[PDB]
Amino acid sequence: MYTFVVRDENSSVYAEVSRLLLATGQWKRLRKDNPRFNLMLGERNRLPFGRLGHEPGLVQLVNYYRGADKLCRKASLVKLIKTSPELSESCTWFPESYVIYPTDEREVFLAAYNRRREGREGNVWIAKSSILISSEASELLDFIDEVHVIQKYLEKPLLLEPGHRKFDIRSWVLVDHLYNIYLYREGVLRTSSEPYNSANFQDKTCHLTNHCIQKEYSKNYGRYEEGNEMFFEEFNQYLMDALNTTLENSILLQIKHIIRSCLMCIEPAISTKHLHYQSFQLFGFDFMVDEELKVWLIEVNGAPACAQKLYAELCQGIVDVAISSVFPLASIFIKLHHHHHH
Amino acid sequence: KLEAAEERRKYQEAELLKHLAEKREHEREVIQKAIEENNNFIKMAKEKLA
Amino acid sequence: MRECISIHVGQAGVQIGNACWELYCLEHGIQPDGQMPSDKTIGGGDDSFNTFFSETGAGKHVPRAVFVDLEPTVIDEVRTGTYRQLFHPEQLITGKEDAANNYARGHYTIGKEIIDLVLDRIRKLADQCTGLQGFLVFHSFGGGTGSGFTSLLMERLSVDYGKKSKLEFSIYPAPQVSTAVVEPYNSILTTHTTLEHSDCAFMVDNEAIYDICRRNLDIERPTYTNLNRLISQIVSSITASLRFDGALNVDLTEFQTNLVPYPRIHFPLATYAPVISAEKAYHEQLSVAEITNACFEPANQMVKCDPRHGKYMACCLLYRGDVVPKDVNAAIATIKTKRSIQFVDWCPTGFKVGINYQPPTVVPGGDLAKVQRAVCMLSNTTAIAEAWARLDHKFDLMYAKRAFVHWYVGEGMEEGEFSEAREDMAALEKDYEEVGVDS
Amino acid sequence: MREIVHIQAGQCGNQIGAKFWEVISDEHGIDPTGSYHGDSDLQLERINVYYNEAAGNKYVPRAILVDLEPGTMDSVRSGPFGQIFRPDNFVFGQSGAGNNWAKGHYTEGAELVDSVLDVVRKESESCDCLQGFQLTHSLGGGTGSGMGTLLISKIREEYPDRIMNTFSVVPSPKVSDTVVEPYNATLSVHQLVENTDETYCIDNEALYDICFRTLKLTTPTYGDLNHLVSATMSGVTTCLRFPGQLNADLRKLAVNMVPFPRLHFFMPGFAPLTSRALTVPELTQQMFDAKNMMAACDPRHGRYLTVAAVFRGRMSMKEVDEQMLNVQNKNSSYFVEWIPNNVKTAVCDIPPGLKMSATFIGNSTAIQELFKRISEQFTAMFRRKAFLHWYTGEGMDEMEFTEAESNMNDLVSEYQQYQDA
Ligand SMILES: Nc1nc2c(ncn2[C@@H]2O[C@H](COP(=O)(O)OP(=O)(O)OP(=O)(O)O)[C@@H](O)[C@H]2O)c(=O)[nH]1
Ligand SMILES: Nc1ncnc2c1ncn2[C@@H]1O[C@H](COP(=O)(O)OP(=O)(O)CP(=O)(O)O)[C@@H](O)[C@H]1O
Ligand SMILES: Nc1nc2c(ncn2[C@@H]2O[C@H](COP(=O)(O)OP(=O)(O)O)[C@@H](O)[C@H]2O)c(=O)[nH]1
Ligand SMILES: [Ca+2]
Ligand SMILES: [Ca+2]
Ligand SMILES: [Ca+2]
Ligand SMILES: [Cl-]
């Protein structure tokens, strides 16, 4: 009997992983503060990593990588990309971003904001934190004061027909205890149900593609697809019919490159390869696609939820590759790897 | 701080030896009660017969 | 030349001191009878080895050492063992009954009756010193004597030798070899009372040494003899700068200056490589780059914790054997580009390096293979606070129910001393977080 | 920490006491004349804990034999190791105690107790550094129960900084001499709760059930019961008697095993059970099995506050550590989470006619079942004041029985409090 504890009651992914472990009959749930566990399904904040791997006779595994927050907080991601040689200031798949406090990057942000004014270039930006869209600098900075990042807003998104409507792509990625990077083969498009309007940023329902914002404010919620959720089989059909390409070629090569670049960058800092306890973590990567079919990373989520119909398959995937790999009982993933010589 | 500790140990000890002293007092009263009841039985049998 | 006095307290302190002095004799060519043929100045001198050894007219080299235990059985093994002639009887102090794994019994009840005798025997060693630097104190956190007697002794040494450095070598408790459920109580009580009296403390987690012995020496079930021979190698690495000619960590004061910029944050992490099995019939000898890279592996640390997730305030590399600065500097450059080494903003990002050309000595018939080069890294990292967090959590679990507290109160300690000691550890955990974590 | 003084009181105390000295004399290579004829230095290293050295390298048990009647001590003096005891350490009256706690504690026992303390003082005075006392007795009779607990109170008065340890045989209707056993046991438990540091609860219910169910003895005798007791007593004193790290003296055992002063009643266990070759997995599973416990309590009905495990024989220390970790990890819910690492393990190289054995000492909240069972038998009689005249005849009042019952019900509540926490 392998043993596990549950320290985050509000996680839908790990409530389902918990139910699956119990139904194998080879896993026993302990009280949350019992130290004699094989597996911690940990809390989101102040997880006590310092108390892991000091139980003699127990191999201990946690479902979070200590230090992964560098990737999964807006301010940290911007700093990590600029300052890591392997991502660099000249990184082509991350929007031009600046950290802004109410250290700071105000006067470097204004300098670049003037080059667009100067050259008559499209000069819309987005302020956000762990939300406002304007082409006027001093209105963004006023709002912040009233820790944030100002990020170039993507003025030319790809638009789904019918509906002339914006979207983002969620990819789920599992990093196992050996630092294999597994991309779940099912992603999801979180769509707008409103047509896109480049002359009205005040109205934020046709600009922001979150599942909560469209469910409340948008008066077309569910008109095109169940939820505001288009899955890969349909989006691939759409790209073949309308644009004469595939999801694999036009978008997924770039997504896989970006996931591998982000996670290979922090590997020396978070790897548990030679450590007294071991880690895995499920990440949610959020992408925008522009009208040239160029892919942009928006953010990395350290504690994502899943689309309703993919819970079953993904959670079984987590027990198969993350947990049973370490604790064997008595593929839905693409393994991201590339060994090019130069 | 060392003398203060020693005085708390001496206090707890004097408290114990007082409690054990009440126990010896009670033991002395049980056996005197046993004697007094045997003597009172003999006495009262002697008087009833007379 | 400036003398150091070593003080070994309780079973762990005494058995580790046995292993250290055995090793020092082998390193300096001192025989079990105290004779040192290579020493041409008979009856005295101010050589570097005289920091740790005094000399009689008859050519006997005598450790500047006191051994204290509250029961006799461990020190009786020194009195009748291989090195019995090395020590004069007045250096070896024993009581009749021990502190029964109880800080309060060591500190208050039995400490009060033996403390004046121990200070008298220490005063006798101090009186033969022309320039006493101070004290090296070896003890467990977990035992009643190691915890309670040591904290009383450290307080009295601050009073009687106010200008003297005090360095500790402290054994942090591990359940794989521990003998008491109350070791976390004893650890927090002694850390609280000692913290203001110690300049620099090297913690050794018995769990880390145990695992190094299992993993790297292939010992199925390590004994204290196995653990102590490894601990003595690391202690010898640390004290070598006091016992040999050199220009780094040459006095006790220099340990504080080089490793401890903030007085309360005085617990450097030791990391040692390489540890190689003597039974291993084929061994490929490790380069300067390999042993230096091994200093950044948690598996080689004296305390298991993750320095990638804290900040450095100081780093010393102490090399023994065939090492030149060129190879050290190339090793460091390679490591900087590959590892997460983050210093605090107010400290230079840098390494102080010491090289002693004499390779590490091993005890004949021991578990350690003879190697051509070895290194001990001493780093002051905030990551060592993980070990405080573990101990504080175990303390909190038991103290919430007052489990075993009546044994401490029964020795004349107040319950208040528990919550005061614990509050001092909360403030220590917070000090490490302020220095270590960003916002 | 060195010398232990052993006291054995009444029929039960002296019968199990004599078997204890036979068994440990054989382990230490001491023959019935007190001469050492053993083959190992391990046998003599801590011999002084239990034995005095006399003229001509003779070893004499630090043992005092007490009874209010001579019969059982005459049988000891004639028994195999009878000539090894110091003759002046036999202290006996002629009256007997009639299975009456009041006679042992207040009337007959009070007459004899001063001459027992004279012998305790003589043994105590020649100790380099006395650790404390162990008493063997039953709680169901009069001398062991009533005079035994009187002695404990007087020893505490004269040696208040020393440890007091008992081997206390709890009565059972299945192995019963009189109906008043529950009265004698309740009055005794009230004394033990206040005046011992550590009590081994040896339940005649459990010993009978082991002899009947496990060892297939159709008709268990006191001899069969005492074979289990002497093997357990050898097991639980191994760490006091042989070189070792863990629980090596009475005060260190108490500090490891007793988190609250009143909860000092231990459930001993032994494996294998005996009237050919046991693996470390099998020792470990059997030593933790309800059927190997010497107190008739289901450990799955409570939680372990603390456990000491002692393995004896030539075996793998790695396999002992792995198996002991396996039991805790697989049954984690039965070990209180608020005493971390509450299971300690010792290994001694000298086995007891076995190649290997394991002794278990548990401080379990399930021990409340033993006290509740005695409490129910006490109340059934006490509600009708049945058989009280035997006690009021010796000067006792009903109120003393009401106080003993309340204190034992309080002890039950306290075990229940830590079981729910
Ligand atoms: N590394 C190592 N640890 C030891 C040694 N001896 C004991 N320990 C550890 O020290 C702690 C117990 O403290 P001891 O030093 O035995 O106790 P003491 O200081 O003698 O105190 P009392 O016996 O209580 O008077 C536990 O954590 C043991 O594992 C030893 O030789 N080496
Ligand atoms: N630079 C940019 N250009 C265009 N649209 C952008 C953008 N940055 C964000 N968005 C819009 O905002 C959405 C994401 O906002 P953001 O990711 O900052 O919030 P959030 O963290 O609440 C989402 P999640 O629930 O996935 O964590 C995208 O779906 C997109 O519609
Ligand atoms: N296990 C065991 N129990 C005994 C023995 N002798 C008596 N008993 C039990 O002890 C109790 C009677 O007390 P006993 O020691 O005979 O009376 P005492 O001489 O007045 O102390 C009853 O519970 C009996 O079941 C014995 O040799 N072994
Ligand atoms: Ca000289
Ligand atoms: Ca000072
Ligand atoms: Ca008489
Ligand atoms: Cl001074």
Ligand SMILES: [Mg+2]
């Ligand atoms: Mg987000």
Ligand SMILES: [Mg+2]
């Ligand atoms: Mg000791």
Ligand SMILES: [Mg+2]
């Ligand atoms: Mg009888």
